[PDB]
Every structure is written in C-alpha cells, then in structure tokens.
Amino acid sequence: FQGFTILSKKTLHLGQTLYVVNGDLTEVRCDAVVHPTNGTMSFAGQVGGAIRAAAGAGVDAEVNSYMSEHSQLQVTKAAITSGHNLPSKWIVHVHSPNYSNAATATDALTQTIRNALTLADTKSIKTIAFPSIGSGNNHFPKHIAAQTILQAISAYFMSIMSSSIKEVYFVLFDQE
Ligand SMILES: Nc1ncnc2c1ncn2[C@@H]1O[C@H](COP(=O)(O)OP(=O)(O)OC[C@H]2O[C@@H](O)[C@H](O)[C@@H]2O)[C@@H](O)[C@H]1O
C-alpha cells in the first residue's frame, strides 16, 4: 500500500499515531525523514545513499554550509536541511551511535531519537519517518534497535506538554 506493508498502529500520549511499516524510507511522502549519519553528515550509510540519490545534488550545498559553520555534528545530535527532490519536505540528520558498547549504546540511541523529535518539533514538523537507526553500518542488533527506538518515540510524547508532531512512522527495511 503506497509502497509499504503496514504492520501496526498505536496511539501515543498526545494523540500521535505511530505506524510500524516496511518499505523504503525515501518513498515516504511526509514532512521529514531521518538520516542516520556521522559527524561529517555524509551520505555514506545505507539509508544515506538512498536519501542522497532521491534528494539530488541540491542537498549537498546545505550540508556543506552547516559543516562549514560547525565542523561537526556531535554524536546523538540532530540537524535539519531541506529534502530537495525527496518526497519529504525535510531531512533530519542525526549522528547515529555505534554499537561499540552494548551497555551504553541503547541510552545513546534513546537520546538520538529524542534529539531528532525535539528538533523536528521546533520546526513545527507534523509527520516524521525513522529508519532503524544504528542497526545497519553501526551494528545494533535489529531487535534492540527497534525496541529502543519505539520506546523512545513513545516516551518523548510522555515527556512534553505539546507537540506539532501528529504521526510518526517507524520504517523497517528488508533488503535492496
Ligand atoms: N532505503 C531504506 N529505507 C529504510 N531503511 C533502510 C533503508 N536502507 C537501509 N535501511 C536500513 O536502515 C537501518 C540503518 O542502516 P544505516 O544507514 O547503515 O544506518 P546506521 O546503522 O545508523 O549507521 C550510520 C552510517 O552512516 C555513516 O556516516 C556512519 O559512519 C554509518 O556508517 C538498517 O537497518 C538498514 O537495513
């Protein structure tokens, strides 16, 4: 349906709808998609390559301007650029944590999700789509990533009084 298998739906604390779906993040037409990247904001990751192909060269200039001013996106932190030719309006870039330390990696992933949602909310983003951050090149076990991200999303809306965000999509991905 519209590029995706729709697996489940849940209502969150402030009336958000959380969908778990399976498909290609870059085919989501919403306000923002979330790009798991590193401190240089490259598109070298698995998702990142697909985002860069769908967005086109325009996205490069915005990333370059940001990196020219800031030099680094710190781990777990987020930054936003236009999505250019992507179906989605914005890209929320997050410096994805590595699964170097199972004992602290889930805390870092939780914080990454919360930082992405926080930043999206300041931009009045209404719909946002997350891939399984960390579980590709950064080696999170898939089930630990899913559980941690889904719990982080629910907890974010438990922790605030108001939000512009109305739907969150968690996008699972099978293979190329
Ligand atoms: N088009 C896609 N849509 C949705 N999910 C996808 C897609 N393509 C791959 N995935 C899945 O997204 C998840 C994250 O994979 P990565 O893109 O490799 O992200 P991550 O594990 O967070 O590593 C970040 C990567 O970016 C680099 O700059 C950094 O050094 C690291 O290599 C994986 O489960 C992967 O199967």
* Residue-range definition of the domain harbouring residue 21: 1-176
Own/partner long-range contacts of 64-72 (Cβ < 8 Å, ≥24 apart): 66/41, 67/40, 67/41, 72/39, 72/40
Within the chain, residue ranges assigned H as helices are 46-55, 58-70, 102-122, 142-158
Q: Which residue has a Cα nearest atom 15 of ligand 1?
A: 136
End-to-end Cα spacing for the chain: 18
* Overall resolution, Å: 2.0
Which two structure tokens, joined as six digits, stand for 86?
């992507």
Task: Give the dihedral of Cα atoms 22, 26, 30, 34; nearest 10 deg.
Answer: 90
Technique of determination: X-ray
Which two structure tokens, joined as six digits, stand for 52?
């860069």
At 85, which amino acid appears?
A: N
CB of residue 23 inside a 6 A radius of ligand 1: no
Question: Dihedrals φ, ψ of 61, to 5°?
Answer: -65, -40
> Which of 19, 47, 74 maximizes ligand 1 atoms within 8 Å of its Cβ, making it the mutation to test the pocket?
47
Q: Spell out the residues 6+ positions from residue 136 whose beta carbon is closer than 8 angstroms to its own.
A: 36, 45, 46, 47
For residue 133, the Cα-to-chain-centroid distance in whole angstroms is 7
Number of Cβ within 10 Å of residue 123's Cβ equals 15
Q: How open is the CA angle 57-77-117, to the nearest 5 degrees? A: 90
Number of Cβ within 10 Å of residue 85's Cβ equals 12
At 165, which amino acid appears?
A: I
Task: Please tell me the total count of domains within the chain.
Answer: 1
Judge contact between 53 and 149, C-beta under 8 A.
Answer: no
